[PDB]
Amino acid sequence: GMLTGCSRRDILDDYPVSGVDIKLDWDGVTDQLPEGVRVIFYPKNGDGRKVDKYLSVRGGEMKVPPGRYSVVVYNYNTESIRIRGEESYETIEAYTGNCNGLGIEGTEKMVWSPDSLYVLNIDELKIEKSEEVLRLDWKLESVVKKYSFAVEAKGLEYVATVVGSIDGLSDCYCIGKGRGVCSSQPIYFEVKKGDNKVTAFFTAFKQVKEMTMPTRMSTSERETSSEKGAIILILKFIKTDNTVQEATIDVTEIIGTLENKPTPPPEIELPPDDKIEVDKPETP
């Protein structure tokens, strides 16, 4: 392992600071609270004077000097999810690693499913010069969508293991931009095999931030581009002789059906023409 050290702002103690007090509400956000959150203030006026702090899951005091900023708040302790581009609001991106150490061919080209990420991103916040502590009341947004499905498949007796992948979903999330992005690298997921069914669970980032920013004012005509992307589910059946048979399913029109005492996963009905059948392995 290799660690990256940092220090506090040296003229944060020399220059006057009207501190802020962040309170975080998690009511109806999640019952499984994160370890804590990271808060970054990117100055708009200033030459890269970013005020950065790790806080309690409930928030806390933080000394921000006055000025116009862009803000990001996300949960730091995550398994699959990694952060890059933290130097600028416009580049801070959440991503997953490529599947390493799996025994099935082609998993190296795939990325892991993202674990839970909670984000708040304000394009513009103006901290004024104040004698008293400015009180922010924030709530974070779950930017990771969960999916599940079940599909009927003949001859699973011939299958050793099944490896699922889903192309076309957001496997990256631009925290500052508030949009998910697709790296064209499939998200890998394990598939549970029954006798006549296969069940799987996976996750992906939201295409776009759903939080309402009542104060956000855009001068550019509103953006809509979801349809310019096909969503393909791939089931890689590894046979008992280590042979592989793949099944490619286009879930573009039903992807929403798959989002979610728990509920059994939605069945992906196939025409009798496109039924999944694993052919008995060849014999000498």
Swiss-Prot record:
Q: Known PROSITE patterns for this protein?
A: PROKAR_LIPOPROTEIN
Covalently lipidated residues (N-palmitoyl cysteine) read C6
Q: Where is the composition biased (Basic and acidic residues)?
A: 272-282
- Give a Pfam family name: DUF5119
Question: Where's it mainly located?
Answer: membrane
What GO terms fall under cellular component here? cell outer membrane
Q: Where is the lipid attached (S-diacylglycerol cysteine)?
A: C6
Q: How does it sit in the membrane?
A: Lipid-anchor
What keywords sit in the KW lines? Cell outer membrane, Lipoprotein, Membrane, Palmitate, Signal
Q: Which domain of life is it from?
A: Bacteria
Which InterPro entries does the annotation name? DUF5119 (IPR033410)
Q: Where in the cell is it found?
A: Cell outer membrane
Cited function: Putative fimbrium anchoring subunit.
Annotated family: Belongs to the bacteroidetes fimbrillin superfamily. FimB/Mfa2 family.
Name of this chain's protein: Putative fimbrium anchoring subunit Fim4B
The organism is: Bacteroides ovatus (strain ATCC 8483 / DSM 1896 / JCM 5824 / BCRC 10623 / CCUG 4943 / NCTC 11153)
